[PDB]
């Protein structure tokens, strides 16, 4: 029996706000400007209090002649107001800036804050790796002029999750983050991220679901009903896994002994034998195809793509990116760098092996940890104890990162930038600390 | 490749399967990786006769190659 | 006022900026830029 997918259901209730009496001006504010979702709240709380995708609508009402503004979870109330959602992220950066100001105003309104002459709380901000000077300049402008905050500090979300899962701040490990739009590999030495050996592959969740979108467009060019981006996102989330060995799995997934079990049929919502032909297996699975059935031609068949699309991270040549794979880049980092002779692991490499951490938004795909453990056992010398740590939800460990950082006041003051330092040194200033970006030169 | 430690026997099985896409058509055979460990130790028992050792030392033309 | 400044010209703007910095230094090795972290191509076929 084929399954039918839809859009995710809209929220029946709107998002509540925190009580204004519980606000104190001494507590900092933790924000995570992710490419997919926004996480906002205090520091003393450990559990999340505000998670919503970054979107905004300008709903023009006919009767009142007033442009209403719906932010984040308020966009998940009607289908028309969901479809007109606009993200501020254009590419891997931000381009429109006033949208960032009104979503920050929405977070400040929904945090239960009654401020005066701007926000009196220092803020904790995550930023992408090798961030371009213009957006951090504009960030300094908006926080140091629009919101009057006393202090600011910055860092990478992957290193922040690494510091969260290694709270001593002096450990050695190798972090891997699979973000919404980029995949990063950072070798960490003694609690400090070695960013001169960091590596980035231009693929993420957004490129993967666009790969699903144009793969489904190419596979069924005569499909009548255009399905939205959310359907592609949901069936990528629910019906995709990392293959344990892509060379051996691809030579048997088209057999009839797998297509009875490993084929997912997805029904679109609306109101000379075929056994020996692999076109009929690839398009219509192991069940015979009747072109006169109305429910039949509204169907996807996910047989090869479920193991094909997570393999783009391991081999970027499928996705068109002329880059080395995650396993090959990790081999380059681990076997020929940090004083490690190929064939003779240094103690830095041995310490990096035992603290391999996978985080990010795109670690939810099953079979990733077992596959990277299999590859690591494949290329390392025999007898090396390989440890891979994976969170239950690796999309929230960054907020745990700034929570543990601002709870640790001893090392919190090493990374902060006040109004006074910015005012004396301008926007062009780099604060060289362990858990953030370094200087662009030597 | 195949290396025996005690006698130094060298046998080339073939090129690895990961290097099978350097050319679309090639004269080399591509064998996969060995699924076991690199190092393999095994104790055998060899049974020979005295006539075999008599004929091993008494080759008139000369010793044969591998 | 603020120009829209799409992300397509931003990489070229940073490339021109870092080229300006290296040419003024030439008249200094980079450490961690956008074009230096970015991945080398695969050696295996």
UniProtKB/Swiss-Prot annotation, chain A:
Keywords: Isopeptide bond, Nucleus, Phosphoprotein, Transcription, Transcription regulation, Ubl conjugation. One of its GO terms (molecular function) is enzyme regulator activity. One of its GO terms (biological process) is chromatin remodeling. It is found in: Nucleus. This is Actin-related protein 5. The modification Phosphothreonine is found at residue 13. Present with 2170 molecules/cell in log phase SD medium. InterPro entries: Actin (IPR004000), ATPase_NBD (IPR043129). GO terms for cellular component: cytoplasm; Ino80 complex; nucleus. Component of the chromatin-remodeling INO80 complex, at least composed of ARP4, ARP5, ARP8, RVB1, RVB2, TAF14, NHP10, IES1, IES3, IES4, IES6, ACT1, IES2, IES5 and INO80. There is a cross-link at residue 1 (Glycyl lysine isopeptide (Lys-Gly) (interchain with G-Cter in ubiquitin)). It comes from the Eukaryota. Belongs to the actin family. Probably involved in transcription regulation via its interaction with the INO80 complex, a chromatin remodeling complex. Its main location: nucleus.
From Swiss-Prot, chain B:
It is found in: Nucleus. Signal peptide: none annotated. Probably forms a homohexamer. Interacts with RVB2 and may form heterododecamers with RVB2. Component of the SWR1 chromatin remodeling complex composed of at least ACT1, ARP4, RVB1, RVB2, ARP6, YAF9, VPS71, VPS72, SWC3, SWC4, SWC5, SWC7 and SWR1, and perhaps BDF1. Component of the chromatin-remodeling INO80 complex, at least composed of ARP4, ARP5, ARP8, RVB1, RVB2, TAF14, NHP10, IES1, IES3, IES4, IES6, ACT1, IES2, IES5 and INO80. Component of the R2TP complex composed of at least RVB1, RVB2, TAH1 and PIH1. Interacts with SPT15/TBP and HSP90. Belongs to the RuvB family. DNA helicase which participates in several chromatin remodeling complexes, including the SWR1 and the INO80 complexes. The SWR1 complex mediates the ATP-dependent exchange of histone H2A for the H2A variant HZT1 leading to transcriptional regulation of selected genes by chromatin remodeling. The INO80 complex remodels chromatin by shifting nucleosomes. Its ability to induce transcription of some phosphate-responsive genes is modulated by inositol polyphosphates. The INO80 complex is involved in DNA repair by associating to 'Ser-129' phosphorylated H2A histones as a response to DNA damage. Present with 11600 molecules/cell in log phase SD medium. This is RuvB-like protein 1. It comes from Saccharomyces cerevisiae (strain ATCC 204508 / S288c). The lineage of its organism: Eukaryota, Fungi, Dikarya, Ascomycota, Saccharomycotina. The gene is RVB1.
UniProtKB/Swiss-Prot annotation, chain C:
Probably involved in transcription regulation via its interaction with the INO80 complex, a chromatin remodeling complex. Also involved in the regulation of telomere length. It comes from Saccharomyces cerevisiae (strain ATCC 204508 / S288c) (Baker's yeast). It is found in: Nucleus. Present with 1720 molecules/cell in log phase SD medium. The chain holds residues 57 to 111 of 166 of the full protein. Component of the chromatin-remodeling INO80 complex, at least composed of ARP4, ARP5, ARP8, RVB1, RVB2, TAF14, NHP10, IES1, IES3, IES4, IES6, ACT1, IES2, IES5 and INO80. This is Chromatin-remodeling complex subunit IES6. Belongs to the IES6 family.
């Amino acid at each position: 029996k084929a399954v039918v997918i839809d859009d995710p259901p809209l929220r029946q209730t709107p998002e509540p706000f925190d009580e204004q009496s519980a606000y104190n001006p001494q507590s900092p504010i933790a924000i995570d400007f992710g490419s997919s979702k926004l996480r906002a709240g205090f520091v003393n709380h450990a559990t999340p209090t505000h998670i919503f995708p970054n979107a905004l609508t300008k709903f023009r009402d006919r009767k009142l002649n007033k442009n209403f503004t719906f932010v984040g979870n308020d966009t998940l109330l009607d289908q028309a107001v969901r479809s007109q959602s606009r993200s501020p992220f254009d590419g891997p950066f931000v381009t429109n800036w006033n949208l960032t100001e009104e979503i920050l105003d929405y977070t400040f309104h929904h945090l239960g804050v009654v401020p005066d002459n701007g926000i009196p709380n220092p803020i904790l901000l995550t930023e992408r790796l090798a961030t371009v000077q213009s957006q951090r300049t504009n960030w300094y402008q908006i926080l140091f002029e629009t919101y009057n905050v006393p202090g600011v500090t910055f860092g990478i979300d992957s290193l922040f999750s690494f510091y969260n899962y290694n709270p001593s701040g002096n450990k050695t490990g190798l972090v891997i983050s699979c973000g919404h739009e980029d995949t990063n590999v950072i070798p960490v030495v003694d609690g400090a991220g070695i960013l001169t050996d960091a590596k980035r592959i231009n693929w993420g969740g957004h490129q993967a679901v666009d790969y699903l979108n144009d793969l489904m467009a190419l596979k069924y060019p005569y499909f009548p009903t255009k399905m939205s981006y959310l359907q592609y996102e949901t069936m990528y989330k629910d019906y995709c896994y990392v293959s344990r060995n892509y060379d051996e799995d691809i030579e048997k997934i088209l057999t009839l002994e797998n297509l009875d079990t490993n084929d997912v049929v997805v029904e679109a919502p609306f109101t000379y034998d075929w056994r020996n032909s692999i076109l009929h297996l690839f398009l219509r699975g192991p069940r015979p195809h009747d072109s006169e059935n109305i429910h039949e031609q509204h169907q996807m068949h996910l047989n090869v793509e479920r193991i094909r699309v997570p393999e783009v991270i391991f081999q970027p040549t499928m996705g068109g990116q002329d880059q080395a794979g995650i396993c090959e880049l990790s081999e380059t980092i681990l076997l020929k760098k940090f004083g490690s002779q190929p064939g003779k692991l240094s103690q830095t490499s041995i310490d990096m092996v035992n603290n391999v951490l996978i985080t990010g938004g795109n670690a939810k795909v099953p079979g990733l940890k077992e596959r990277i453990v299999k590859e690591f056992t494949g290329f390392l010398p025999t007898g090396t104890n390989i440890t891979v740590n994976m969170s239950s939800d690796p999309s929230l460990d960054a907020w745990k990162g700034m929570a543990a950082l601002a709870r640790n006041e001893e090392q919190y003051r090493k990374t902060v930038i006040s109004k006074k330092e910015y005012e004396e040194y301008g926007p062009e200033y780099i604060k060289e600390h362990k858990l953030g970006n370094t200087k662009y030169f030597e | 490749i195949y290396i025996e430690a005690n006698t130094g026997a060298v046998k080339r099985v073939g090129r690895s399967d990961a290097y099978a896409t350097e050319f679309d058509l090639e004269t080399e055979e591509y064998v996969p990786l060995p699924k076991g460990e690199v190092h393999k130790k095994k104790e055998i028992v060899q049974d020979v006769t005295l006539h075999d050792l008599d004929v091993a030392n008494a080759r008139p033309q000369g010793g044969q190659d591998v | 006022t603020r120009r829209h400044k799409s992300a397509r010209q931003l990489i070229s703007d940073e490339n021109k900026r870092i080229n300006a910095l290296l040419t003024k230094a030439n008249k200094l090795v980079p450490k961690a830029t956008y074009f230096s972290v970015e991945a080398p191509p695969s050696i295996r076929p």
